[PDB]
A paper describes a structure:
Transcription termination is an essential step in transcription by RNA polymerase (RNAP) and crucial for gene regulation. For many bacterial genes, transcription termination is mediated by the adenosine triphosphate–dependent RNA translocase/helicase Rho, which causes RNA/DNA dissociation from the RNAP elongation complex (EC). Rho is an adenosine triphosphate (ATP)–dependent RNA translocase/helicase with 5′ → 3′ directionality. Rho forms a ring-shaped homo-hexameric complex, mediated by the CTD.
Cryo-EM maps of Rho, apo RNAP, EC, and type 1 and type 2 complexes are shown. For the cryo-EM analysis of the EC-Rho complex, the EC was prepared using the same DNA/RNA as in the RNA release assay. A 125-nucleotide RNA was elongated by adding ATP, cytidine triphosphate (CTP), and uridine triphosphate (UTP), and the EC was stalled at the first G stretch on the DNA. The EC holds a transcription bubble containing a 10-bp DNA/RNA hybrid within the RNAP main channel. The EC is stalled immediately before the G-triad of the template DNA.
Residue numbers in the entry:
A (entry chain K): 2 to 92
B (entry chain J): 909 to 1236
C (entry chain J): 2 to 55, 81 to 114
D (entry chain I): 1 to 761, 785 to 1119
E (entry chain J): 1363 to 1505
F (entry chain J): 512 to 795
Write the structure that this text describes.
Amino acid sequence: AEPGIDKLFGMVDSKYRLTVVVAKRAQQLLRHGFKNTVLEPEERPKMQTLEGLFDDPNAVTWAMKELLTGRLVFGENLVPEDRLQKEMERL
Amino acid sequence: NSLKDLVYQAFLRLGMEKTARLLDALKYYGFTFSTTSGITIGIDDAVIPEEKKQYLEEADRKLLQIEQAYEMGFLTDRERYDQILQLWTETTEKVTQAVFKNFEENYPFNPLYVMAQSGARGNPQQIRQLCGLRGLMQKPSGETFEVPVRSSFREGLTVLEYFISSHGARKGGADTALRTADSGYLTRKLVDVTHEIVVREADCGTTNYISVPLFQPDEVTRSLRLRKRADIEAGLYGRVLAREVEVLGVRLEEGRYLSMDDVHLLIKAAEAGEIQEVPVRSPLTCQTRYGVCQKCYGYDLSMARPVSIGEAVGIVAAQSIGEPGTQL
Amino acid sequence: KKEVRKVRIALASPEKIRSWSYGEVEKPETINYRTLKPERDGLFDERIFGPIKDTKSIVRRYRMGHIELATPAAHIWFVKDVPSKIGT
Amino acid sequence: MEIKRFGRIREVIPLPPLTEIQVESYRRALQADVPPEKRENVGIQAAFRETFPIEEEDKGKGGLVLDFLEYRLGEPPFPQDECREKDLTYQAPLYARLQLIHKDTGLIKEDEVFLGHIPLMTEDGSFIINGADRVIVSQIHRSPGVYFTPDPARPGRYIASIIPLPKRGPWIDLEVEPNGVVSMKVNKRKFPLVLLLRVLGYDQETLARELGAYGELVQGLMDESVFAMRPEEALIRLFTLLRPGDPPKRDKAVAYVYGLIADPRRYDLGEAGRYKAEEKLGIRLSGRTLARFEDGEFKDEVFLPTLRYLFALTAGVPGHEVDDIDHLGNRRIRTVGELMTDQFRVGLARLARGVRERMLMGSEDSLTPAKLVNSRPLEAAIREFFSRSQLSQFKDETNPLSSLRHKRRISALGPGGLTRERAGFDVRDVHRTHYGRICPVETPEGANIGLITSLAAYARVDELGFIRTPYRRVVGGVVTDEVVYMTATEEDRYTIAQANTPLEGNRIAAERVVARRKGEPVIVSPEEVEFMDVSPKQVFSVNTNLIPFLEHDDANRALMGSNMQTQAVPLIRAQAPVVMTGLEERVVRDSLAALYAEEDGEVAKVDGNRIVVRYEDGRLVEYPLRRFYRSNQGTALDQRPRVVVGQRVRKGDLLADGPASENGFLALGQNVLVAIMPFDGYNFEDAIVISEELLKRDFYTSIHIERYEIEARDTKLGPERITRDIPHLSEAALRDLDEEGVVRIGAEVKPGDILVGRTSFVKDTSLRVPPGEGGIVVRTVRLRRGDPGVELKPGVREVVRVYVAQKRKLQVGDKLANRHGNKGVVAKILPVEDMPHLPDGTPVDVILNPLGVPSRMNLGQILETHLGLAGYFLGQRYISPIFDGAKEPEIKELLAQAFEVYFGKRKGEGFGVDKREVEVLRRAEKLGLVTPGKTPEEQLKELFLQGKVVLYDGRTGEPIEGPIVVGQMFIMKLYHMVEDKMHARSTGPYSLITQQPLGGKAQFGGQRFGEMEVWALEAYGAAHTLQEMLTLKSDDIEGRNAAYEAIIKGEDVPEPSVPESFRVLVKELQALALDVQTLDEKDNPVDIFEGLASKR
Amino acid sequence: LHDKHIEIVVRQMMKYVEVTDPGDSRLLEGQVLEKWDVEALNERLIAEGKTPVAWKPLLMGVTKSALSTKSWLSAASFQNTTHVLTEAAIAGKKDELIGLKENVILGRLIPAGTGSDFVRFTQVVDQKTLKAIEEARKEAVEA
Amino acid sequence: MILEAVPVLPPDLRPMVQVDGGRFATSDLNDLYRRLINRNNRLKKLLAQGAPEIIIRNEKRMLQEAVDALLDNGRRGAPVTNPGSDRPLRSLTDILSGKQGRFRQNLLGKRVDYSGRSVIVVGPQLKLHQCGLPKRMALELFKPFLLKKMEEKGIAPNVKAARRMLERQRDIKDEVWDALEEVIHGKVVLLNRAPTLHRLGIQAFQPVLVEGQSIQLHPLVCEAFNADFDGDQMAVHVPLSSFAQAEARIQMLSAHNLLSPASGEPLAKPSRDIILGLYYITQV
RNA sequence: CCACAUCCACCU
Ligand SMILES: [Mg+2]
Ligand SMILES: [Zn+2]
């Protein structure tokens, strides 16, 4: 499978919410680019033939490994949505 | 069955990744040891027990007796047909028992017997047809032929016996080719009628439930006995207790999902004779607008944990009901 | 821009039918064999359904016509349904 | 290499010509060979003499008498070779001699008038219609005659049915209603039969002493005595009861249309309807049907016997005299001849109506040749029957066995008014009368189960759709060589023994003999036996008879093995099975695929393409060979020479091999060393593990020919020219396109390479190799407007067809199977080094999973494996009948001899028993396989008797624990079309109405997602996957375009929009008086279209 | 086979009642039990006027239950387009997009699974962006 | 409720297409519309010229029948095409209703872009979360992703060059295979069996590039699908969006679906051969 | 261009 699906299910009330969180994190990682990650310093995905898993081979694994750590928060309404949603599309 | 229980226990007590790794290891080692063990099927592996021989003779003698019993006018056509059918269906079971006893006693490592004991392939009826006899054959009219098939596939079937078995072959082919369509139509009906059910919920204040019985109300004219373990498991496993119940010194709190261990404990307690009905929540009493709530739905899923909110339980329910219909 | 929330189905008035269509067809001439272009004001007229040459041809996928009958007629659905709606 | 046969049965008669049904039917239909003066009249001449001779008494210019004298046909316009090369019809023009007579003077006789071209049967038994060849399959239906059926509701009485043909005609139904009503419903309205009986000239007194003498139900008809006292005006009231509105003074309008010819069936005299009449009831049925018209009055020969017989059965009991609907003696076969004759007489009736109309319009008389008969209706009817009919279907030339089976198939279906797909459950089951006439195993699985079947090997339709089974006459205790072909009704009266009963030559050797009283297995004495089965082979079809050990197989796997024997491709070097049944030589001989010497002689010249043979009479004949002929299904048909220059040959001796014959023996497959053991995982459930030895030597290899075709046609922009030069770009790739427009022969072509260069109005529209595979160009044919004898589709100036051949080899995609229904797909091709091998250096070729044996019931393959193991060392072949094969002691003795030879060869070099063999033997001793206390010599011998030998792993070198069963199996590669090829596309053609993508020839086309897959997808929590797969990847054109551009740009796909299918649905709703619009959260309409719906 | 699925189907089988004592509608008409419950709660408690809508549960087959539904899209696409479309055309049937079949027809997001409003939107921000916006929040809370 | 003006469907919804040699294939909608237009024009002309009452009434009945036949065919009589082809014309209701109608072709999404199908073979060396995909069909299915990946590096200057490079297989290179392997490192594909009886008929897998024509399938899922290896084929689909990729990899991956939804019985249980081997090793 | 009809097969 993928690293720690059991604790990923444990830290969320429903699997569908986990899917929404991981996919939204992946979309952010794409459209921002991979700069705003919380796993930059040492713990990063390791590619086989080179270190190609530095930049962008597959972002779902990035989002999952990023959510495995405790630097992420998710909720129904945690931040004023209007400002960030208007800054999401107009930049 | 041991492997299935092992897999279920590993999934319950370990999780997802560990169960998958265990399955991979089991598959790899099973392949390697099946290869090195050398299981082969020859014509001599379909051993014909000698005792069954005289069994036929005995039946034949009894057959002759029934024959003369008909020529004296003591029996009617229906009575004679019933007697012949009962005699042959009894000697068939006797031959099957003798075949399996011979396999147990003389050749424990016989490929046919080894495959039959394990869940690999085959059934006792198929093993009997290979080594014993495929006696009773159904007529196209729906009844059964009076004359059975004495020979087996280890021996050579007579032309008439093969022509008779072609009846059953054609019946099976046509029955599959039409019952598949009927089952598909039923599945479509159920999916369309049930497609609107989705678990969207805050826990509904339902002070209602259903009492699942634990005893068969009528197996004889007037008697009570405990239901089969499979039926009780299919009725109780993964449900939510309506109200707190203490049956064997253990307090099963209200609102607790019934795991497999709880079902086993309840079955043991019912065997001891403490309770007869289990009050549990059910979708039938749920008050949700369009669907059922998490509590009233239950606990059984692809995983073990309680159902996630937002799952389309209606379509999976319809698929679960309709899938076995094609193999019925 | 607004999201779809409900789908309403109802009867269409003759005014609605005339509002839908852009002109009326009168000739039962689909397309001439020699001239691959549309023949006349019939079922494939150029000016009644839009340009056939690359607005794109997609307008012809959505523009509708209409026929003004000199005699009124009733929908077969409302007269031949098992409960005859006009009949009830 | 010797051939050893096991069965002890004297086949008194050999197999009849396996394709004689269609050939004899067509030869009886068309009597071209015999002079027209001959007495033979049934067939096309029957139709001519029945319908054509129109007579006109008084209608304007009366006295019209157009009579038929003779018909002839003797010359096909072209031989069949270019009738296949060019899309013509191998037909013959039909000429008829007509003559016209009027009431005045005049003999206007035209000896020759052309009326349509009728197709001619080829030598094998097929027809060529438009280039390709088709077969017309026989039909089974209710035989015409008089039947009796129990009432669906009333249990005391029943109904009688006299059934003529066609449907637009009589269908007489007699019912006895308890109020004393003899109801007779002819077409749609019931009728008291008493009035018709009175019309027939029968009074009450003869009805009393001829019908009511024995039965008390005559009061059910004699009660109506108030109205039975009229000779002739009863006919007038009978016509008045009808509702045509016509005046009652029409004596022979409808009362006589049920007379001689028009309405009543003209079923063939004696057997078609008379045998169903004369045998069932009465004594004889004089004439064709019930009528007299020489005195105005009417006569009967059916109504009175039918009433007498019905009253006898309903009151008394002459016998259990109720006809079964599915009894094969009451069912009749319309062969190709009968169907062709029916369609021909339909066309003749159309021509008769046309000529009657022309005569009515025409004024003068000297107009017999042209102004009367026109060939258009009859020719159109014949062409429609031979092209668009349901029973005239594409020939299956995968192999000679496939063609033969397709030629001898019987279908319950047909035009549509007889039997139909959706509901046929009652008639799908086999019947007790199918024994010896219809194969109970040959039916194809699927929707067409039970409806379509094949007749038995010894089965034979005699003259009128009545299958007859051969039976040996038994007188007392001696079995006579006399053989009689019997029908089901004839068979139901005697006791028939079995072929397996012990015999002392010409004497029954058993006391208790198994027999069939009436389809019922009983045991009797030899003195009560009248008939004997000729052979077990008469119970199964030709295809089913090829399975050696059928007696040890399940019916279902035997069915599918027989079915898959049809679809086995011919191999480059195919060899006959080690274990045979004995019909292979008969199959290859009767199927006209090989060459045989017609007379004793000596071969003169032998080449790769023709053989010149000089016979004993001094006449030399040249036999050409279809060297590489593409079949209907794309396989290769080859005749390989099998004789040497200056070699003496006998009559009927083999000259050249067929497409799938080794030496006069049906060889479609290979003989390979098979080990029945489970390998690692590569034979898991039904998969198959094969050696690389089978690939290092070309052992499973077939030539496949694909025929591409492209035409240049005259367009309004200008004619398209097949020219070498390409307009815009391709000149580097033009090297392969050697000549003008056509690619050179022998040039390999890959996908995307030009085959034919065509230029449209200039624009490049050239035929290229489609994505997938391409091989070697072998042939190219060009047809132009300069027609020697060819005809083309109007508007098309020319056409070119290119045949590309490739040499397919066995790989993972392919599937293999044996004659016992053990299907399998090659899963891995192992190298030679790591496969299991014998104690000798020889390794096994194929490894089969044993778990497929006990789950199903196919033990015949195990016996075949043991016998092949014996024959591999003995170097000989075995022929064993299906139900008289080799007994287990015989196979054991053969295995003992084989082990003697094998281990003697082993000891010849001075070797004993390996230590690995020692440990294997001790382990088997612990398993009870071998008796203890014996030396490894006889222990290994006893193990060999079981058919199991010690194998070595090869990967590890250590022996496989426990003995392994190995032998020789006949494994054949099944038909392999594009099914394995990956129809994987990413972007292709889209449909017009909806934008859902579907391609085909250009691109593979999208995979179905249906609703069950949708239900499964939304059973999960997947919502965005379904959203994109219904709109982004399926229909939303702007969405799919934007997604494609974004993916190219390496960005996330955009949000999907409303699919075009919903827009189509909305517009179709708006086409009706309906009104559908999408609404916002409030009651504000939202336009799904951008602005296109809004006007301007 | 477990009993949850059969119970779901049986509940959907008899989700219909027909009233005996009329309230604000006709008597011998059958429709959703839950709608009648809402009407009774509105009539007795929420609004003034004690008019008991005395109903009885009606058990109808799977086909009849599937055909007679509030949403006309599923009924039209299921068994018989003609009758369902005629009935939905007599009275303007504003099909609320509840149920998976209608959303499949329109191609929009499925209400079940990921599309459920319970989990449809879930804002996700990493630690540093959350800290920045929360610093903005607490500096908006002056002093 | 009765209609005075009859709507007319857009032309592309009832197109006339050249087939070969100038012949036109047309939907029955065009024929019905032509008949209605001709009959209405005849009625207008007849009403304009004169009023023979019986002829006018007959023409009114005829026009009403034509309108009814256009709206729905078969409810009264059976109007047919030109004589010689007795196939009833297809009306609006036939387009809508039926087992093959507009509702039963848009509810289903009968066609998909990024999809393929092939015969399946056993995959014993594969892990449970993996499937074997032939490299040619894998390259074809992931074509736009491959184009983008090789545009990232120096294989091709622009996407047109990459497409013309990949259009002919004689230009295949090891760098292209390496790029294709890099593309599908984290992607998953949906495998499907033709009869989708239950939820497990669709399963996500991690593709592994293999040499051959068949799809390698893990033996343990031989029971989740009703798929043996006697020649049956399975289909493969490729989700595109990262949202759908996460969905498939989380809640449709075969590694996460080990137990039935109908009951608690597992479906990833050891199969026939594994059971046989484990029984043989653990027997006394 | 692929529409529809008919037929034969393959996997359940
Ligand atoms: Mg299969
Ligand atoms: Zn609830």
